[PDB]
Amino acid sequence: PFLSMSNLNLHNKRVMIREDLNVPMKNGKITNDERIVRALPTIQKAIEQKARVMILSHLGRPEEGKFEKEFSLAPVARLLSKKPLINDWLKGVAVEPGQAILCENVRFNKGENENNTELAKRMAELCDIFVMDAFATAHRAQASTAGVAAYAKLACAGPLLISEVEALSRALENPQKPLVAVVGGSKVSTKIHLLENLLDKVDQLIVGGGIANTFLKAQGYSIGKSLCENEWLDAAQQFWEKAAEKNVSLPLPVDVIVADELSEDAKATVKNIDAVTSNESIFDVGPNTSATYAKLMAQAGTIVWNGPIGVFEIEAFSQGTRALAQAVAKSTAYSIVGGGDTLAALDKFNLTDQMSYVSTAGGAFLEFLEGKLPAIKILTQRAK
Ligand SMILES: Nc1ncnc2c1ncn2[C@@H]1O[C@H](COP(=O)(O)OP(=O)(O)O)[C@@H](O)[C@H]1O
Ligand SMILES: [Mg+2]
C-alpha cells in the first residue's frame, strides 16, 4: 500500500520519526511507559543504521503557543536515554549520525491542530525522510501526522504502524474464513458505521450490551428498563434486514441475566428474553446465548472483537464476557481485539496475552475498521 522504513536507506540521513510517547503522568513522573517500550525498536533500528534521529511526539493537550512544563517531553527524554530534549527545533538542529534527539511536544506549536500548511512545510524542511510510526494518531489530520508527510522529500511508515496495519487488515481483506466479528457497547449510535463495514466482510456477527438490547427491541421483544437507544430502532431493524439478505448470521441473545438494581448485591435471575418484566434490565447474556457464541468462536478462522457483552465490571454480570473471552483464547482463529473497556476486561480475567493482537489505539483502531485515515492516505500517495 505504502512505503516502509525497512525498504529505505537511512545511512547518515536526517530522519524524523513521529511516535506516540503520550504517557500518563502524576505530579511530574511517569506512571506507565508501555508506549516508550513499544516505540523503542523503531528508534533502535534508525540508530543502528546510523540515522540522524529526530524523535517527534505529542503529550497531553497543551495550549498551542503556551509552553508549560506539565506538558514537557522532558521526563520521556530522560527515560529514553536510560533505554536530549530539543526545544527550539523548528529553526533547525544538528544531530550526529547514530544519536537521537527528542523534539519538544509538537502540540505546543501554533498550528498543529489545524494542520497548517506553513507549519508543515517547515517541519518538512528539517528532514530528508519522514517516518509516520504513530497509528494511534493517524485518524486525525495534524501538521505532525499529515501535513509534514504531504511535503516531506521522502515519506513512509515505521514498523509499529506496520504491525498494526498488518494485523487489522490481515483480518479484513483476506481473512481466514469464517470471519466472526463481536461488537459490544453502550450504544448502537457510536458503532453503527463499524457494523456497516463489517457486514460486507463477516460470515457471523454478534452484538452485545446496549447494542444487543437495542436490536432485541427493534425485533419487538420487551426489555424493561434495559439500556437502549430508541432513536436507532429503525436503524437497528434495517441493519438486521441487510444482514438477512446478505446471509450474515446475526444471533441475538435468547437468554439474559436480569436484576432490578445494578450491584453485586441484588437478585440476579437467568431468563428467557420472553420473560423480562417491566422494571428489570438486561446486564448479561445467559448460558444458551454464550454457548452459541462459544460455538462460533471455536469454529472461527478469524475473530475481531470490540466491546464487552455484559456489565463485566460487577461480578454477577461478568460470566458472559469471560465465557466469550475464554472462547476466543482457547480458539485457534487469529484473534484481534481493541477498545478501552474490552482491554479492561481482558486485563480483569488475565487473558490479554492469549489474543493474537491487542490494539491499544482506541479511536484509530475503530475508525480503521469503519473503513475510513489521513496519515495512511499520504504514505501511499508518496509510495506511488
Ligand atoms: N447492557 C448493558 N447495560 C449497561 N451498560 C453496559 C451494557 N453492556 C455493556 N455496557 C457497558 O458499556 C461499556 C462498553 O462500551 P464500549 O465503549 O462499546 O466498549 P469498548 O470501550 O471496549 O469498545 C462497558 O464499560 C460496559 O460496562
Ligand atoms: Mg459480561
Short mmCIF file of C-alpha atoms and ligand atoms in Angstrom, two decimals:
data_model
loop_
_atom_site.label_atom_id
_atom_site.label_comp_id
_atom_site.label_asym_id
_atom_site.label_seq_id
_atom_site.Cartn_x
_atom_site.Cartn_y
_atom_site.Cartn_z
CA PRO A 1 0.00 0.00 0.00
CA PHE A 2 2.74 2.48 1.00
CA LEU A 3 6.50 2.85 1.61
CA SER A 4 8.26 1.40 4.65
CA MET A 5 11.31 2.32 6.76
CA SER A 6 12.72 -1.19 6.16
CA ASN A 7 12.88 -0.61 2.39
CA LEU A 8 14.65 2.78 2.61
CA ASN A 9 18.33 3.59 3.13
CA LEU A 10 18.86 5.71 6.29
CA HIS A 11 22.69 5.94 6.28
CA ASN A 12 23.69 9.42 7.51
CA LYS A 13 20.28 10.94 6.75
CA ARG A 14 18.13 13.21 8.89
CA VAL A 15 15.18 11.06 9.94
CA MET A 16 12.07 12.40 11.58
CA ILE A 17 10.10 9.69 13.43
CA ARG A 18 6.60 10.55 14.66
CA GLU A 19 5.86 8.38 17.68
CA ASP A 20 3.10 8.10 20.31
CA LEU A 21 5.07 8.70 23.51
CA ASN A 22 1.95 10.28 25.15
CA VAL A 23 2.46 8.62 28.53
CA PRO A 24 0.37 9.01 31.74
CA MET A 25 1.89 11.24 34.47
CA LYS A 26 1.40 12.03 38.17
CA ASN A 27 2.81 15.28 39.53
CA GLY A 28 5.82 15.19 37.20
CA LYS A 29 6.57 11.44 36.93
CA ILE A 30 5.58 8.68 34.50
CA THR A 31 3.13 6.03 35.69
CA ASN A 32 3.02 3.90 32.51
CA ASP A 33 5.78 3.62 29.90
CA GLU A 34 4.40 0.85 27.70
CA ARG A 35 4.40 3.32 24.78
CA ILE A 36 8.09 4.08 25.09
CA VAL A 37 8.85 0.34 25.37
CA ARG A 38 6.75 -0.20 22.22
CA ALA A 39 8.34 2.68 20.27
CA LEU A 40 11.93 1.76 21.23
CA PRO A 41 12.83 -0.69 18.41
CA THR A 42 11.96 1.85 15.68
CA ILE A 43 14.44 4.20 17.34
CA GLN A 44 16.99 1.38 17.80
CA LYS A 45 16.84 0.38 14.10
CA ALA A 46 17.35 4.01 12.99
CA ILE A 47 20.41 4.45 15.24
CA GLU A 48 21.79 1.02 14.23
CA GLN A 49 21.64 2.16 10.59
CA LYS A 50 23.31 5.41 11.76
CA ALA A 51 20.46 7.78 11.02
CA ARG A 52 20.48 11.28 12.45
CA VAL A 53 17.33 10.77 14.51
CA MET A 54 14.71 13.39 15.41
CA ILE A 55 12.01 11.82 17.61
CA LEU A 56 8.64 13.56 17.31
CA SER A 57 5.66 13.17 19.71
CA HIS A 58 2.64 14.70 21.37
CA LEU A 59 1.89 14.85 25.11
CA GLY A 60 -1.44 15.75 26.65
CA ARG A 61 -3.40 18.73 25.35
CA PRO A 62 -1.45 21.97 25.88
CA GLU A 63 -2.50 25.47 24.70
CA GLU A 64 -0.87 25.99 21.30
CA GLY A 65 1.89 28.56 21.75
CA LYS A 66 1.93 28.31 25.55
CA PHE A 67 4.83 26.29 26.93
CA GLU A 68 4.18 24.59 30.26
CA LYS A 69 6.43 22.04 31.98
CA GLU A 70 3.30 19.99 32.73
CA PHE A 71 3.26 19.03 29.03
CA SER A 72 7.02 18.81 28.50
CA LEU A 73 8.54 15.65 26.98
CA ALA A 74 11.42 16.09 29.49
CA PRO A 75 10.65 13.01 31.68
CA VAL A 76 10.34 10.98 28.49
CA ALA A 77 13.73 12.29 27.30
CA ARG A 78 15.37 11.05 30.49
CA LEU A 79 13.52 7.74 30.25
CA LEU A 80 14.60 7.31 26.58
CA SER A 81 18.31 7.88 27.29
CA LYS A 82 18.13 5.33 30.13
CA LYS A 83 16.98 2.85 27.47
CA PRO A 84 18.47 15.46 24.79
CA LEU A 85 15.20 17.41 24.78
CA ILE A 86 15.42 19.91 21.87
CA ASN A 87 13.19 22.92 22.39
CA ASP A 88 13.68 25.40 19.51
CA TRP A 89 13.71 22.56 16.99
CA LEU A 90 11.82 24.31 14.15
CA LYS A 91 14.73 26.60 13.28
CA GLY A 92 16.95 23.50 12.83
CA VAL A 93 19.12 21.04 14.76
CA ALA A 94 22.49 19.45 14.16
CA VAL A 95 22.31 15.74 15.01
CA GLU A 96 25.29 13.42 14.59
CA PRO A 97 24.87 10.10 12.76
CA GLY A 98 23.76 7.40 15.22
CA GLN A 99 22.50 9.67 18.02
CA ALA A 100 18.86 10.65 18.61
CA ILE A 101 17.13 13.79 19.87
CA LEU A 102 13.56 14.27 21.12
CA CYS A 103 11.76 17.37 19.89
CA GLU A 104 9.58 19.11 22.47
CA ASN A 105 5.79 18.38 22.46
CA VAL A 106 4.54 19.07 18.91
CA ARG A 107 1.22 20.33 20.25
CA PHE A 108 2.92 23.47 21.60
CA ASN A 109 3.29 24.77 18.05
CA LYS A 110 0.74 27.34 16.83
CA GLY A 111 -0.95 25.38 14.00
CA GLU A 112 -0.52 21.68 14.82
CA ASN A 113 -4.22 21.03 15.38
CA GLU A 114 -5.33 22.82 12.13
CA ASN A 115 -2.68 21.02 10.01
CA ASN A 116 -1.40 24.45 8.98
CA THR A 117 0.41 24.40 5.64
CA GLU A 118 3.21 26.80 6.57
CA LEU A 119 4.00 24.88 9.77
CA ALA A 120 4.02 21.60 7.85
CA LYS A 121 6.37 22.81 5.11
CA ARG A 122 8.76 23.97 7.86
CA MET A 123 8.71 20.53 9.52
CA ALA A 124 9.39 19.03 6.06
CA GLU A 125 12.35 21.40 5.63
CA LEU A 126 14.02 19.90 8.74
CA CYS A 127 14.38 16.33 7.40
CA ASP A 128 15.35 14.11 4.47
CA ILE A 129 12.92 11.33 5.45
CA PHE A 130 9.70 11.34 7.50
CA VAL A 131 8.58 8.15 9.23
CA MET A 132 4.95 8.04 10.43
CA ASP A 133 5.16 5.43 13.16
CA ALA A 134 2.08 6.61 15.14
CA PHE A 135 -1.16 4.73 14.28
CA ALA A 136 -2.91 5.96 17.47
CA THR A 137 -2.68 9.47 15.94
CA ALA A 138 -3.25 8.64 12.22
CA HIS A 139 -7.01 9.20 12.34
CA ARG A 140 -6.70 13.00 12.62
CA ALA A 141 -5.11 15.50 10.27
CA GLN A 142 -2.44 17.45 12.07
CA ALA A 143 0.82 19.07 10.91
CA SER A 144 2.86 16.36 12.65
CA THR A 145 0.70 13.40 11.42
CA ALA A 146 -0.49 14.51 7.99
CA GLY A 147 0.81 17.88 6.74
CA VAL A 148 4.50 17.11 7.20
CA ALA A 149 4.15 13.86 5.22
CA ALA A 150 2.40 15.78 2.43
CA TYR A 151 5.52 17.95 1.83
CA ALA A 152 8.49 15.81 3.06
CA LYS A 153 11.18 14.78 0.48
CA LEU A 154 10.63 11.12 1.35
CA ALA A 155 7.70 9.81 3.47
CA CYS A 156 6.98 6.31 4.82
CA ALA A 157 5.53 4.27 7.69
CA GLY A 158 7.52 2.78 10.58
CA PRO A 159 7.27 -0.86 11.79
CA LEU A 160 4.67 -0.22 14.55
CA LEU A 161 2.15 1.32 12.14
CA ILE A 162 3.18 -1.68 10.04
CA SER A 163 2.35 -4.24 12.74
CA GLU A 164 -0.96 -2.56 13.49
CA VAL A 165 -1.93 -2.27 9.81
CA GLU A 166 -0.81 -5.86 9.11
CA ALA A 167 -2.97 -7.24 11.93
CA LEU A 168 -6.09 -5.18 11.33
CA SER A 169 -6.09 -5.54 7.54
CA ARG A 170 -4.96 -9.20 7.67
CA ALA A 171 -8.32 -9.88 9.32
CA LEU A 172 -10.26 -7.60 6.91
CA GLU A 173 -9.10 -8.12 3.27
CA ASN A 174 -8.31 -11.81 3.17
CA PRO A 175 -9.41 -13.29 6.48
CA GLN A 176 -9.05 -17.00 7.12
CA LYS A 177 -12.77 -17.88 6.93
CA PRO A 178 -15.14 -17.96 8.72
CA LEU A 179 -14.55 -14.40 9.92
CA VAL A 180 -16.55 -13.51 13.05
CA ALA A 181 -16.98 -10.02 14.50
CA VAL A 182 -18.21 -9.43 18.06
CA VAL A 183 -19.35 -5.85 18.71
CA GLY A 184 -20.47 -4.68 22.16
CA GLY A 185 -21.00 -1.43 23.97
CA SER A 186 -23.36 1.09 25.44
CA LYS A 187 -24.69 2.49 22.17
CA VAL A 188 -25.65 1.47 18.62
CA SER A 189 -25.08 5.08 17.60
CA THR A 190 -21.36 5.01 18.30
CA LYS A 191 -20.78 1.71 16.47
CA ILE A 192 -23.23 1.66 13.56
CA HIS A 193 -20.64 2.67 10.98
CA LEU A 194 -18.43 -0.19 12.20
CA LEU A 195 -21.28 -2.64 11.85
CA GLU A 196 -21.85 -1.39 8.27
CA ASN A 197 -18.29 -2.01 7.10
CA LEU A 198 -18.01 -5.41 8.83
CA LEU A 199 -21.34 -6.54 7.36
CA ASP A 200 -19.79 -6.60 3.90
CA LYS A 201 -16.98 -8.74 5.25
CA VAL A 202 -18.06 -11.15 8.01
CA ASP A 203 -19.78 -14.53 7.98
CA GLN A 204 -21.21 -14.26 11.50
CA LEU A 205 -21.78 -11.07 13.55
CA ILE A 206 -22.53 -10.80 17.27
CA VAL A 207 -23.88 -7.74 19.02
CA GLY A 208 -23.64 -7.34 22.82
CA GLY A 209 -24.84 -4.97 25.57
CA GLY A 210 -26.74 -1.76 24.82
CA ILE A 211 -26.28 -2.62 21.13
CA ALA A 212 -27.89 -6.04 21.57
CA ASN A 213 -30.60 -4.58 23.79
CA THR A 214 -31.42 -2.09 21.00
CA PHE A 215 -31.59 -4.89 18.42
CA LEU A 216 -33.79 -7.10 20.59
CA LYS A 217 -36.22 -4.15 20.93
CA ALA A 218 -36.18 -3.43 17.17
CA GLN A 219 -37.31 -7.05 16.82
CA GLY A 220 -40.26 -6.40 19.15
CA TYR A 221 -39.09 -8.03 22.39
CA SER A 222 -39.81 -6.40 25.76
CA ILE A 223 -36.71 -5.45 27.78
CA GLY A 224 -37.98 -3.30 30.68
CA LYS A 225 -35.58 -0.57 31.74
CA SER A 226 -32.59 -2.09 29.87
CA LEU A 227 -30.17 0.33 28.25
CA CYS A 228 -31.28 1.03 24.67
CA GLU A 229 -31.34 3.79 22.09
CA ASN A 230 -34.94 4.18 20.92
CA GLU A 231 -33.88 6.67 18.29
CA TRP A 232 -31.89 3.97 16.48
CA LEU A 233 -34.52 1.20 16.47
CA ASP A 234 -35.27 1.86 12.79
CA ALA A 235 -31.52 1.78 12.11
CA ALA A 236 -31.11 -1.48 14.02
CA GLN A 237 -34.12 -3.01 12.26
CA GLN A 238 -32.88 -2.10 8.82
CA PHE A 239 -29.41 -3.38 9.67
CA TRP A 240 -30.98 -6.70 10.77
CA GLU A 241 -32.66 -6.93 7.37
CA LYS A 242 -29.49 -6.08 5.41
CA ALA A 243 -27.86 -8.93 7.30
CA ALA A 244 -30.66 -11.29 6.35
CA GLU A 245 -30.34 -10.77 2.56
CA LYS A 246 -26.54 -10.95 2.72
CA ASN A 247 -26.94 -14.21 4.68
CA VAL A 248 -24.77 -12.97 7.52
CA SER A 249 -25.68 -14.79 10.71
CA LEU A 250 -26.65 -12.37 13.41
CA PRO A 251 -27.75 -14.32 16.52
CA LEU A 252 -29.24 -12.12 19.19
CA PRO A 253 -29.38 -13.01 22.91
CA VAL A 254 -32.01 -15.73 23.52
CA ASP A 255 -31.37 -15.79 27.30
CA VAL A 256 -30.11 -12.98 29.61
CA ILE A 257 -29.43 -12.26 33.27
CA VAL A 258 -31.57 -9.57 34.81
CA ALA A 259 -31.82 -7.73 38.11
CA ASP A 260 -33.88 -4.80 39.35
CA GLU A 261 -30.81 -2.80 40.51
CA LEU A 262 -27.20 -2.86 39.26
CA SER A 263 -24.96 -4.01 42.13
CA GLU A 264 -23.05 -7.10 43.42
CA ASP A 265 -25.91 -7.41 45.92
CA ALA A 266 -29.32 -7.82 44.19
CA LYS A 267 -31.07 -10.96 42.85
CA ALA A 268 -29.52 -11.96 39.50
CA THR A 269 -32.04 -14.07 37.56
CA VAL A 270 -31.49 -16.07 34.37
CA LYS A 271 -34.41 -15.62 32.00
CA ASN A 272 -35.70 -16.16 28.54
CA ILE A 273 -35.95 -12.94 26.60
CA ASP A 274 -39.74 -13.70 26.71
CA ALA A 275 -39.88 -13.31 30.46
CA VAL A 276 -38.31 -9.85 31.06
CA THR A 277 -40.80 -7.84 33.17
CA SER A 278 -41.25 -4.07 33.18
CA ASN A 279 -38.68 -2.98 35.79
CA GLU A 280 -35.81 -5.35 35.20
CA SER A 281 -32.80 -4.66 32.99
CA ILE A 282 -30.50 -6.93 30.97
CA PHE A 283 -26.91 -6.91 32.30
CA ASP A 284 -25.51 -10.08 30.69
CA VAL A 285 -26.18 -12.89 28.26
CA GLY A 286 -27.30 -16.27 29.54
CA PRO A 287 -25.76 -19.73 29.16
CA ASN A 288 -27.68 -20.66 25.94
CA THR A 289 -26.55 -17.45 24.29
CA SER A 290 -22.91 -17.63 25.39
CA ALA A 291 -22.84 -21.25 24.14
CA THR A 292 -24.00 -20.07 20.72
CA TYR A 293 -21.16 -17.52 20.87
CA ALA A 294 -18.77 -20.21 22.12
CA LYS A 295 -19.58 -22.35 19.03
CA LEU A 296 -18.90 -19.54 16.54
CA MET A 297 -15.55 -18.68 18.19
CA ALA A 298 -14.43 -22.34 18.21
CA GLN A 299 -15.31 -22.72 14.52
CA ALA A 300 -13.82 -19.36 13.52
CA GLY A 301 -10.75 -18.90 11.32
CA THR A 302 -10.50 -15.20 12.23
CA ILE A 303 -12.05 -13.08 15.03
CA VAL A 304 -12.46 -9.30 15.54
CA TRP A 305 -13.82 -8.25 18.95
CA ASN A 306 -14.62 -4.75 20.25
CA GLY A 307 -16.75 -4.34 23.35
CA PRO A 308 -17.77 -6.40 26.39
CA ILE A 309 -21.15 -8.18 26.08
CA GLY A 310 -22.25 -7.63 29.68
CA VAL A 311 -21.64 -5.39 32.66
CA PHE A 312 -18.42 -7.31 33.35
CA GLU A 313 -17.19 -4.76 35.96
CA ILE A 314 -19.67 -6.05 38.53
CA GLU A 315 -19.11 -9.75 39.23
CA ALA A 316 -22.59 -11.28 38.87
CA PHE A 317 -22.88 -9.76 35.40
CA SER A 318 -19.45 -10.90 34.13
CA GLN A 319 -19.96 -14.60 33.31
CA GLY A 320 -20.99 -13.77 29.73
CA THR A 321 -17.94 -11.66 28.87
CA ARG A 322 -15.44 -14.03 30.49
CA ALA A 323 -17.02 -17.03 28.74
CA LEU A 324 -16.59 -15.16 25.48
CA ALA A 325 -13.05 -14.04 26.26
CA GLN A 326 -12.05 -17.61 27.13
CA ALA A 327 -13.63 -18.91 23.89
CA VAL A 328 -11.51 -16.53 21.76
CA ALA A 329 -8.43 -17.55 23.77
CA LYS A 330 -8.88 -21.37 23.51
CA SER A 331 -9.86 -20.81 19.88
CA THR A 332 -7.50 -21.34 17.00
CA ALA A 333 -8.62 -18.35 14.94
CA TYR A 334 -6.37 -15.32 14.57
CA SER A 335 -7.96 -13.03 17.22
CA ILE A 336 -7.83 -9.20 17.13
CA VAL A 337 -9.23 -7.10 20.00
CA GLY A 338 -9.42 -3.39 20.71
CA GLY A 339 -11.33 -0.86 22.84
CA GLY A 340 -10.74 0.80 26.21
CA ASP A 341 -13.27 -1.27 28.15
CA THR A 342 -12.57 -4.56 26.28
CA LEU A 343 -8.89 -4.37 27.17
CA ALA A 344 -10.03 -3.62 30.74
CA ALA A 345 -11.99 -6.92 30.66
CA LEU A 346 -9.10 -8.90 29.16
CA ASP A 347 -6.98 -7.48 31.96
CA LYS A 348 -9.50 -8.45 34.70
CA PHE A 349 -9.72 -12.05 33.54
CA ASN A 350 -5.92 -12.09 32.89
CA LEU A 351 -6.37 -13.23 29.28
CA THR A 352 -4.58 -10.35 27.46
CA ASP A 353 -1.52 -12.23 26.13
CA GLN A 354 -3.78 -15.04 24.72
CA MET A 355 -5.29 -12.80 21.99
CA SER A 356 -3.17 -12.76 18.82
CA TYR A 357 -3.21 -8.95 18.70
CA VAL A 358 -4.27 -6.36 21.26
CA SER A 359 -4.76 -2.81 19.96
CA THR A 360 -4.08 0.00 22.42
CA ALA A 361 -5.08 2.63 19.81
CA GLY A 362 -8.71 3.33 20.79
CA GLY A 363 -10.11 5.71 18.15
CA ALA A 364 -7.81 4.99 15.22
CA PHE A 365 -8.44 1.29 15.78
CA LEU A 366 -12.19 1.91 15.49
CA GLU A 367 -12.12 4.35 12.51
CA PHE A 368 -10.00 1.86 10.51
CA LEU A 369 -12.46 -0.98 10.97
CA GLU A 370 -15.18 1.53 9.98
CA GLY A 371 -13.30 1.69 6.65
CA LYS A 372 -12.37 5.35 6.88
CA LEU A 373 -7.15 7.61 7.68
CA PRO A 374 -5.27 10.80 6.63
CA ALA A 375 -1.84 9.59 7.78
CA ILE A 376 -2.16 6.39 5.74
CA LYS A 377 -3.56 8.06 2.66
CA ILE A 378 -0.49 10.28 2.27
CA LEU A 379 2.00 7.47 2.97
CA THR A 380 0.62 5.56 -0.04
CA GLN A 381 0.25 8.67 -2.24
CA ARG A 382 4.02 9.12 -1.78
CA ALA A 383 4.84 5.42 -2.34
CA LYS A 384 3.16 5.80 -5.71
N1 LIG B 1 -26.47 -4.00 28.90
C1 LIG B 1 -25.64 -3.03 29.36
N2 LIG B 1 -26.09 -2.09 30.24
C2 LIG B 1 -25.31 -1.10 30.73
N3 LIG B 1 -24.01 -0.96 30.38
C3 LIG B 1 -23.42 -1.83 29.51
C4 LIG B 1 -24.22 -2.94 28.94
N4 LIG B 1 -23.40 -3.62 28.12
C5 LIG B 1 -22.18 -3.02 28.15
N5 LIG B 1 -22.19 -1.96 28.98
C6 LIG B 1 -21.05 -1.05 29.29
O1 LIG B 1 -20.53 -0.39 28.13
C7 LIG B 1 -19.10 -0.35 28.15
C8 LIG B 1 -18.55 -0.85 26.83
O2 LIG B 1 -18.79 0.10 25.78
P1 LIG B 1 -17.80 0.27 24.51
O3 LIG B 1 -17.18 1.64 24.64
O4 LIG B 1 -18.56 -0.04 23.25
O5 LIG B 1 -16.66 -0.87 24.70
P2 LIG B 1 -15.09 -0.67 24.36
O6 LIG B 1 -14.64 0.60 25.06
O7 LIG B 1 -14.47 -1.92 24.93
O8 LIG B 1 -15.07 -0.60 22.85
C9 LIG B 1 -18.62 -1.20 29.33
O9 LIG B 1 -17.89 -0.40 30.28
C10 LIG B 1 -19.88 -1.81 29.93
O10 LIG B 1 -19.93 -1.73 31.35
MG MG B 2 -20.43 -9.97 30.92
#
